[PDB]
């Protein structure tokens, strides 16, 4: 039976900021915070993922206030807190969910210092998380249809011949952001069949801006169920869309590193 | 044993992918997927009539060579060429007896005094993986060298170099969607190119990459695994998210 480790790691999230306890105060009830990722050893930003499905900082539990949308998460003593509120299951989709209440950890504001609330699972960039020490986004060259490269310009995205900008920073919150302006997001406005995906701002952190690279080679919008698609397998159209997964080459991609 | 065909004669990018997709399709039933990553079948409990699959390779010259892949790790254990079979030196003895189930109809089985590991094949071929060019051409010329070694035409260094090509172009491309993509762009432009430090490090990390992902917490590694950019660079991985579009197959190491 597989070994059960308990790694200590930073939980990077919305807009590349990490999971932090406010001000480093560990008294029971203090707010858990969205904060720039540090390069230090202070336990305020390092979290141990224990076997009992609990995220702990300096020995204390990341605890949601209640079991309803809007309540914030506080640091609290693990034994004194309620068992059901101290528990979290981190899914391979980037969300961090609580088994009871069906509420995922959301960051309703990309500003530094946002108290982490817990909201309804709409698979938003606000509620996409990644436990890593790499506190800098992974920047790659995304290659897809016919070997072309995903390129962006001032709000327009398509594929073109791979010229060595075509660079994209894969943020921990599940967003894909053009390198030159990393405040902009790979956004889609609707859960419809041919909504052109382009570059907007990362403010709303909605779904349509959150993407997971599935093992089958696609780039899926988790809330949509449709994948990134070059329209009619035609790069010259300069058009990319969300389309139901069929598996053809015009929706298969690869993050070159 | 299941047989899967490929030919460098008229090989297109799609003719390469469905091949690797068919190889993956028979290397594992896809039943055990852990953290979006599929697992090869467990050596313990696997029937020997399900222990191997065979890939048949042909080329512009219509020379045929059939490789044998160990289902538990997708690595090449041997190959039949016409009337003769050839096997790498087995590591243990349980693997030495399963070899006897492979090419039974042929006359003269052969087992080399060397195993099929990169560092020894690199030693035998006198060249490193970082220098041996990969692509359709190299695979074509390698198919010939495996066929003619039986007739004394192929020498041992060219034999070992052919092994490094096939293993990388088949086994590794099955394990990694990334390395398959590296062979993908080579067919696309008709290139003869040695692999990056990116491909080399992935090949050298596969066993460790499987352990850490399976032995991971529900997502996170207990320890990092350092890798490479296409340009030789520093970067380490701490979670399985970045690896999902990269690793296609994992060796079994433990139970969920």
């Amino acid at each position: 039976v597989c070994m059960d480790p308990e790694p200590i790691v930073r939980i990077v999230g919305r807009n590349g900021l990490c999971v932090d306890v406010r001000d480093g105060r560990f008294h029971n009830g203090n707010a858990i915070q969205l904060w720039p990722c540090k390069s230090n050893t202070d336990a305020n930003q390092l979290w141990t993922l224990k076997r009992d499905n609990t995220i702990r900082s300096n020995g204390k539990c990341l605890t949601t206030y209640g079991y309803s949308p809007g309540v914030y998460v506080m640091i609290y003593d693990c034994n004194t807190a309620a068992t059901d509120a101290t528990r979290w299951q981190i899914w391979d989709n980037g969300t961090i969910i609580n088994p009871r209440s069906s509420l995922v950890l959301a960051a309703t504001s990309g500003n530094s210092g946002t108290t982490l609330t817990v909201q309804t699972n709409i698979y938003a960039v606000s509620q996409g998380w990644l436990p890593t020490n790499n506190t800098q986004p992974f920047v790659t060259t995304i290659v897809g249809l016919y070997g072309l490269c995903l390129q962006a310009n001032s709000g327009q995205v398509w594929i073109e011949d791979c010229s060595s900008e075509q660079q994209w920073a894969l943020y921990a919150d599940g967003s894909i952001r053009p390198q030159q302006n990393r405040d902009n997001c790979l956004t889609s406005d609707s859960n419809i069949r041919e909504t052109v995906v382009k570059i907007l701002s990362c403010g709303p952190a909605s779904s349509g801006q959150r993407w997971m690279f599935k093992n089958d080679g696609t780039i899926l919008n988790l809330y949509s169920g449709l994948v990134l698609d070059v329209r009619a397998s035609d790069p010259s159209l300069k058009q990319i869309i969300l389309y139901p997964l069929h598996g053809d080459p015009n929706q298969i991609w690869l993050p070159l590193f | 044993y299941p047989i899967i065909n490929f030919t460098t004669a008229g090989a297109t990018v799609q003719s390469y992918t469905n091949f690797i997709r068919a190889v993956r399709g028979r290397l594992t039933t896809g039943a055990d997927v852990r953290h979006e990553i599929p697992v090869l079948p467990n050596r313990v409990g696997l029937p020997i009539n399900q222990r191997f699959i065979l890939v048949e390779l042909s080329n512009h010259a219509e020379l045929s060579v059939t490789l044998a892949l160990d289902v538990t790790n997708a690595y090449v254990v041997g190959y039949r060429a016409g009337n003769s079979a050839y096997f790498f030196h087995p590591d243990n003895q349980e693997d030495a007896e399963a070899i006897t189930h492979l090419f039974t109809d042929v006359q003269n089985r052969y087992t080399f005094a060397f195993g099929g590991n990169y560092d020894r094949l690199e030693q035998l071929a006198g060249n490193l993986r970082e220098n041996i060019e990969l692509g359709n051409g190299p695979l074509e010329e390698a198919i010939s060298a495996l066929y003619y070694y039986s007739t004394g035409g192929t020498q041992l260094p060219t034999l070992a170099r052919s092994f490094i090509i096939c293993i990388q172009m088949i086994s590794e491309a099955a394990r990694f969607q990334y390395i398959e993509g590296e062979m993908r762009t080579r067919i696309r432009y008709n290139r003869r190119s040695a692999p990056d430090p990116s491909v080399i490090t992935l090949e050298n990390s596969w066993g460790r990459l499987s352990t850490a992902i399976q032995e991971s917490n529900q997502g996170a590694f207990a320890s990092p695994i350092q890798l490479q950019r296409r340009n030789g660079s520093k970067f380490s991985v701490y979670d399985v998210s970045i690896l999902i579009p990269i690793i296609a197959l994992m060796v079994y190491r433990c139970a969920p």
Partner: nanobody, 98 residues
């Protein structure tokens, strides 16, 4: 050095000189820029926003791909377009001759 000849007729009909490989199919429409109309490899489908439901594009690799027009501003010259990977380019694109 040779290419496919997409000869168009027509229910618009279009044939190639290999569609098995040739990726997708594309119909393009007035004496205005050459806008888009409408299949993937399998293939599936991609229609322009003006002509959803009215138009249907079909495929059968085993060398033809159609386009059925059902139900004035759509009057123009329509061309069938092909895509795929290359051996000559950077990728393959073929326009036809209706």
């Amino acid at each position: 050095n040779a290419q496919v000849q997409l000869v168009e007729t027509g229910r618009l009909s279009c044939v190639a000189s290999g569609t098995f490989s040739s990726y997708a199919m594309g119909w393009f429409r007035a004496p205005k820029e050459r806008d888009f109309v409408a299949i993937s490899l399998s293939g599936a489908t991609y229609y322009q926003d003006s002509v959803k439901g009215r138009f249907t594009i079909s495929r059968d690799n085993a060398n033809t791909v159609y386009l059925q027009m059902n139900s004035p501003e759509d009057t123009a010259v329509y061309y069938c377009k092909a895509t795929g990977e290359r051996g000559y380019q950077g990728y393959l694109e073929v326009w036809g001759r209706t």
